[PDB]
Amino acid sequence: DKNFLVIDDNEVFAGTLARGLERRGYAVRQAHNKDEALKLAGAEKFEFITVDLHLGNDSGLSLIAPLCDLQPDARILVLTGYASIATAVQAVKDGADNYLAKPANVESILAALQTNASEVQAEEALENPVVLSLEWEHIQRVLAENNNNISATARALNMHRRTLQRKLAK
């Protein structure tokens, strides 16, 4: 069957995604907060579920384990405008099948939900390492002040760790 649960507090985004999925033949329900997500996930069987992390006042990450318990057969994808390695690690531990940064289109969201999608994506990443172009001197200073710690340096510079690393790469 093709029942899809979209969990995101942004109802406009959620509606656009729902309409795109419906045009592809999915039957879509939306939840805009943790109460609604648990109500829905306790009432109907879903084959696919998307989960926003910054769920208004609620933690989307905190929903993943309870969702897996309610929906053991569902494929579950974190779909987030706040992407980070740290949340991706914890989301997978909690039971998420995959994790995608916004913006993503409907085709890529469906792709990311399929069996083995993560393994393909990991290989593609290893084949395509990223490098990014006075700023250099400022980052070398903050990095040295943080005992050569990119995580601490990332937080101080208000940039992603991945961005720091790509900029530091030869």
Place this chain on the structure above:
Amino acid sequence: DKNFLVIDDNEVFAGTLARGLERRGYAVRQAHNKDEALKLAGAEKFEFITVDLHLGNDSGLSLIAPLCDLQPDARILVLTGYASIATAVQAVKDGADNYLAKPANVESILAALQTNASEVQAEEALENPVVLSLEWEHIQRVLAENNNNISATARALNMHRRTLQRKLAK
């Protein structure tokens, strides 16, 4: 006990890490390729293991499951100069306990190996969203040419998805 296995093909980096761990009382073995890693992990019990992804001619990612089978009690950390969400997702599925971008110092490597470290790091990330500063017009063009897909856009621009997202953020 405090037996530590460092798996990295860069023997200079591996030696510097080993010496820093030894000064903290760990007994360290190094493996520089997949053959050595499996030989060591089949011969002695380790409490901690670090795994490089781009392991010379070898896949570090491919080592994680066999290492968990040989070393069910070990804490296992991916430590990589090629960080990506996609490899972090797959590494955790394979059994890694955590994942850190290089450069990291010895204190942060040890921190990342402790129980519950990932959950703390995920919370810290959600509290500290990142935003980054004509380039805008070029990224809006590639994004539109890729059907609003940040993953495809990231690969085309040769930048990290996280970097794109932070630069797109309001």
